[model samples]
Target: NVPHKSSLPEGIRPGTVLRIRGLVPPNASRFHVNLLCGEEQGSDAALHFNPRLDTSEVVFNSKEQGSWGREERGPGVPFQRGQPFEVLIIASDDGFKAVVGDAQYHHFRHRLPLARVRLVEVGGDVQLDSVRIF
Candidate 1:
């Protein structure tokens, strides 16, 4: 169900689905969603989810080679800095599946279960307006 505000009221749980709509900063080089696990923030519970080619295997921490610089908007989509976009994240038993703008951008299987995730931090100088959970 869609929430009226930006925060996740019930918080996120396993099988929880989240939809985020926001605008990235104009100076942003890249945009990403992070599935933070563990009890303490910035602990060993943080994992990054970014878009990559279909043939690529998930790489932890390190950026995927030749995976950067894809346009999501019009001619020369050029990371619009503060432009708005939408992201969808579905929590599975194993991990979270993320969709960025109509593209299957990432599959973030939990190295640790979703029950361990105490917080969801949507960042990168983006202005998040709404979030829906199911």
Candidate 2:
């Protein structure tokens, strides 16, 4: 299940770098990310680019590719039920570059350009504390 933030504050502007800190439930072995764009606020305009560690192949539209079903990371890297983790996202001209924890988890390039993506939404069972936009 996914819980979205009701609204994004005014300070989260485009072309800015933002960091999200939070805790992801231990049960959640995999997750999905989408950049909410358009005036409507729920449109998934950004493309999700995730890489397979074992294959080293880049996967596009990851959520649709069934990559979530293939598990590569081990239990050691499992989400710490209550402990906090961090995710970094930089707004690029093409789209957003996202880094989960210290690893380059994925790159979400916008198919409709960065200007089209106005809001960012993180799905799944993660609890976000703050979004720091720089």
Candidate 3:
């Protein structure tokens, strides 16, 4: 029900799973999920995962101290407009990998300390019924 930045009681670490179940709004030009350094405003996005539906691209990047890194674009849009989606983010050795719906989706390489990430943000042209980090 909540779509704002949510503070994680504990950081996402090895073996943790972050799950988001939501619906994409019609004609969604973009939406994003961010694992962040803290719940404070202006905090760095440890993982900036943006899906640009208009272009059928998923842009993944990281920012530290207000500087964004190079972007990684995934090729497919995967889900249709106005449909439900299940986004699963699993912590891995080198990075994090996501599975959207039942299909393997994007991989976000760790550019920031995973243990330092304390917020999970889901926003932009989407409706999330639930979000879980465990």
Candidate 4:
């Protein structure tokens, strides 16, 4: 399936980390990883990690009440098309930290309570290999 979703039985807190492994196909348009408050459609996403291959940029945002918050774009794309990558999303006191390929990439401040994050979703043009939360 294009969109792979998972639920967090224990929820998330500071020190929680999400490791996602996937492959980006050649000429990928974009792909996104999300941390949501609920599983319902239109639920709020605490973190939205989007990498646009065509635009050569990586954008971060949060969705609340079906509305997307202001986007925070990274300096440049951290993902390479036609390559496999591992992304680490670390939850801390202030926000979520994104690490790609063992390098710290971007930090997304908390727009909503991290404790409310109960779901994770990944979608778009990438092939997901695995997702782990610890």
Q: What is the TM-score of each candidate against the true structure?
A: 0.59, 0.58, 0.91, 0.95
Colliding pairs, model 4: none
How many pairs of residues collide in model 4?
0
Supply candidate 2's per-residue lDDT for 16: 81
For candidate 1, write residues 1-134 as lDDT tens digits. 12122333334766777788776655544444555443343444335544222222323341122132222221223225556777777887776676667877666556554555545555444556776666
Each candidate: RMSD: 8.5, 6.6, 1.5, 1.1
lDDT of each: 0.51, 0.52, 0.83, 0.91
Query: What's the C-alpha lDDT at position 77 in model 2?
Result: 42
> On lDDT, who's better, 1 or 4?
4
Model 2 whole-model lDDT (C-alpha atoms): 0.52
Extract clashing residue pairs from model 1. Answer: 24-81, 24-82, 25-81, 25-82, 26-81, 26-82, 37-45
- Using lDDT, give the best candidate's number: 4
The weakest ten consecutive residues by lDDT in model 2 span 62-71
For model 3 the TM-score comes to: 0.91
